[PDB]
Symmetry: D2
Subunit: 348 residues, 4 copies
């Protein structure tokens, strides 16, 4: 009654039983409900490593989740049995200078679900620090709670860039990260332009609230005309550009289309190296800021969904049961135009 | 009695008379004293253009200056005849959103001395907006005032990075910009490490107050060992790195040696494109910020020199009279190990 | 054809002709349309002085206005004849450290319309610096443009307090300033609670979007129960309280009800001295910040009205023609429960 | 061998044995060395309560301390036996929104040494969370480490006000808090003016680095002339005023002498209520900010002492052994002109 998706090494993902975990003083036991998957899980799956972070031993996969509190540790007072929660996957050490200064996402001893060597939550049951489980209101479904993990990445990128009323935001890309950036940016009051290769997801981008959408593929069109097309579609240049592609041509465009004194947020995760025109950035004081997951963003993401400002449910294109996890990853690995977010439900 | 250094086109710099300018209501007439020169002047000189900013018509050269107030326009009340001033070369429009928001260095109608089409001040006489002429105290010489222009670039880079007590700063390069960054960073209370190719200027860097200096040449040594050498020379990684080289290997190092959550300030001015590991920056939220000249930095630079925190005079390696301007530029163009800052004196 | 409302001294407000002004190089000539009035105008009217700022000589009254461009000075390029604009009344010197740093509302040589000795715009014609006249879009009426002056005070208070998604704001008072704070705070994504004496304006506060309203009169109810009533009406304590009353009992409440680490924005303008519990503020690091008019807030106010986020037109309770100015001031002086904002139209 | 100073109730402070504490997994056992005392300890002593924080049961007194690591809990890796440390007395819950956001000094479940109901460290032995014990360098004595607690209050006040090069700081009062503010402000590069009643401590203020000192007693001289005396002693008005007195006349002065757009930091801890001219603050956007202890300030305080920027040892006017604690408190209670900081040494 605790089937779990265990990754043994590249391409060896096995669905097998695991003992049911027991909650420490400060933790809660969760009966998982939904678990979304992203490129990061897929990458661990194909190559058995997503960086210098290598899967040396079998590791439960999964980090975008929600579930119901079944049991709580002694000192847990804010959550009780039956509470529905979204799981913020990164639990920091709470004692280094990064945690004391409010930057726990940069904690060096951070334990992040499904980042070797720490087990994820694509299982029937999971134990997690209580302070990182956000109680959900009656009008927010468990599925929506699972989507708070990627929406928080968008919230984090908006907050680091200072997105607000009067900001014009250009989101490059319309895959899931680009779409949550549209949602977060619109929720923050920005005017948003969304650029992408697929006319189909630009359609979702529009339903997400993008004010202007443009079919753009820098592999086909020159950068110069892509830029003018974008400049002509709006007033001034965007003062915040969010690159969700990691692609150097897109980053070069981001740098060249961003308004003087504005910012380019890197959320994509490039190849390894990119050849870019940093000189152009300096000449107009464009700042280039990285976004790494989230920090105290979950509560805002939850408020965006709870108040009705962000429909994140429309992001789920495919749904699979835990037994079909491998099929789920395949659907995620293929990345078809009709594929946005792949979701795995866990209740038996 | 108004000899001026006029640049007609690439390599055609002529020393000739110009009429003596007349001060408008808000300006003052200056009898120039000292004018420093930098790579930017040299570049205009060799190629007749320093970007898309091309010298289409003859232009007086020079932008790092000081001088004495000779005459003042009607509405000028804070400066009077005989006052010694440092000239902040960029005068903004004072009416766009960048100027109203306190970012006048980004004003689109900024007129910067010796940036085509605006005339510089390497002449005997020069007229300039009074509010951009900073009165000097008795203990700050006119020569020191001329050096406030490049010191302000260092102040600007420190302030944009938030350099302060507890900050560890790594300055890559020991040419003039690297040296003012050392001076500004030490004046802000930072612990500074300075890296460069020439053992001779690292010697000046040390006299500037650098706490640690290292001979480093990424054209010879691998990045990996350069990094360890730097990591071993100090405690934690520098949380602020100031690249003064524009070189991609140095920027790659900057990105890889900077502490998580820290910042890489771009002050160098690269070639055109650089191949860099932006992905590595994102994985640790390193921000990359550009520094473009200065903004409300002059008064701080002046206070650093006036209070004795920064000896900028030691930066002048060569001194020439206005008549020897071409020789001055040649000394600047050659860039010998013994050459730091070349200064031209203007009083007859 | 240039009737103007001239204040000669306390209680001596005369409607008389003035010559039609002529636009300097950087100004535009406006055919006024609407002019709102506030307590500040009324106070000048009753006492002939609103501080140490005393009306020594006759002064045209009025500072919350809009109008149509009739003629433009030589160098004016962004505005042309026929353009509809909102008039930002404070024009700074553009050359002191406050203006260079982006704090022009604190400029010491600020000239503010209807603040002795500077003439206001309650006249048929008025000349004003072009960069302080904000062009209006087709869907924003001239009347709405006149209301951008008080809405900007609310925007300024929200921005100085950092109001945003997740902020809970308590606005004390439901007179005009309290109402624009509700509008601005809701436009910024905050959850808003509004407290006031009059059940009738709390009704407007609700239509303005306040999430919770409470009849509160500290002259009748003890502070302790007022607080609990407020605490019980919402979740956590408001992290931003905006006092729009200047009253010491209300400020004391603000200090005691504000969440630890939160902020109390002073926008009211007290009597002279107030007896308050600053000690209580310190014990929980409550910051107390003043709001003085606005700074680069107009464009945001305009965007709030243009995009439909703020209905400011519902604020006008009374409308009078220029000929009935004295009646307008009387309606403003009386301050009846049905009186919010009194507006004077200027077109003949 | 574990004598401890136990406060039973107002005026009943007994020196008696306590069992030697045992270190949990994350704590260390300290053999105390020095413990400074302040008004807060004295107040608990005289009235048996320092607010709504009342001493209901016997409580070990003391919170400004240092000592040597004798034993360490299992998971403690950064500190080892024999290490000399300064004890940061407030240990937060590490799980609320204040701790996650980097504001742990505002944690609601903060346990602060000698704040009922939590025991202090004026004893021979004491156990404390390891991450809140800052290792001292060879050139920083244990006595200096005990003084890092009040110096951190000064660091905290400077950082919250943004004290830096170019800041002019006015410190009102020259008791211990005023003196550490002088030290911290000078260490941050500010120009400092210090005002106080006693000519003798102004002498220490000067040795602390104050640039200007003035004998001022608002109980004798009118506010108006106190202000002019201060204005005439420096250039512009101080942009940061640090009130260390809590006295309403001093706060009124602070508000009236502070530069427009500047800040008044409240560090004193007033009576209960103060009658102040908040209206004057609003008219010039003076912000009033509270300082509550410290947050991530200890490392900076330590660096100020370790690098030689702050001589805090000169602050100790009286030294007593643990056996003479009552005499120590009496010396602190009397507050003579020759009394600054009273220190109690603990090693047998
Ligand atoms: Zn993911
Ligand atoms: Zn940590
Ligand atoms: Zn230069
Ligand atoms: Zn401008
Ligand atoms: Zn008004
Ligand atoms: Zn000004
Ligand atoms: Zn104390
Ligand atoms: Zn806490």
């Amino acid at each position: 009654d605790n089937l779990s998706a265990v990754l043994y090494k590249q391409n060896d993902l096995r669905l097998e039983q695991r003992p049911i975990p027991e909650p420490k003083e400060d933790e809660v036991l969760l009966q998982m409900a939904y678990v979304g998957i992203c490129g990061s899980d897929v990458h661990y799956y194909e190559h058995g490593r997503i960086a210098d972070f290598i899967v040396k031993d079998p590791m439960v996969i999964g980090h975008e989740a929600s579930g119901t509190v079944v049991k709580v540790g002694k000192n847990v007072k804010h959550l009780k049995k039956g509470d529905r929660v979204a799981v913020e996957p990164g639990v920091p050490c709470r004692r280094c200078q990064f945690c004391k200064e409010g930057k726990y996402n940069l904690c060096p001893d951070l334990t992040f679900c499904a980042t070797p060597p720490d087990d994820g939550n694509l299982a029937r049951y999971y134990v997690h620090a209580a302070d990182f489980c956000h109680k959900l209101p009656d009008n927010v479904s468990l599925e929506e709670g699972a989507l708070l993990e990627p929406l928080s990445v968008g919230v984090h990128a908006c907050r680091r860039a200072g997105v607000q009323l009067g900001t014009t935001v250009l989101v490059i890309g319309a895959g899931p990260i680009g779409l949550v950036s549209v949602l977060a940016a619109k929720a923050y009051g920005a005017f948003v332009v969304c650029t992408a290769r697929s006319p189909r997801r630009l359609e979702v981008a529009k339903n997400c609230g993008a004010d202007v959408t443009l079919v753009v593929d820098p592999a086909k069109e020159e950068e110069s005309s892509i830029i003018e097309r974008i400049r002509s579609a709006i007033g001034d240049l965007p003062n915040v550009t969010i690159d969700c592609s990691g692609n150097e041509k897109c980053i070069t465009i981001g740098i060249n289309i961003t308004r003087t004194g504005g910012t380019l947020m890197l959320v994509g995760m490039g190849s390894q190296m990119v050849t870019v025109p940093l000189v152009n950035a300096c000449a107009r004081e464009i700042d280039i800021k990285s976004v790494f997951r989230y920090c105290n963003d979950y509560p805002i993401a939850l408020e965006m969904v709870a108040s009705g400002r962000c429909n994140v449910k429309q992001l789920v294109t495919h749904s699979f049961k835990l037994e079909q996890t491998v099929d789920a990853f395949e659907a995620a690995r293929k990345k078809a135009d009709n594929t946005i977010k792949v979701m795995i439900s866990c209740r038996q």
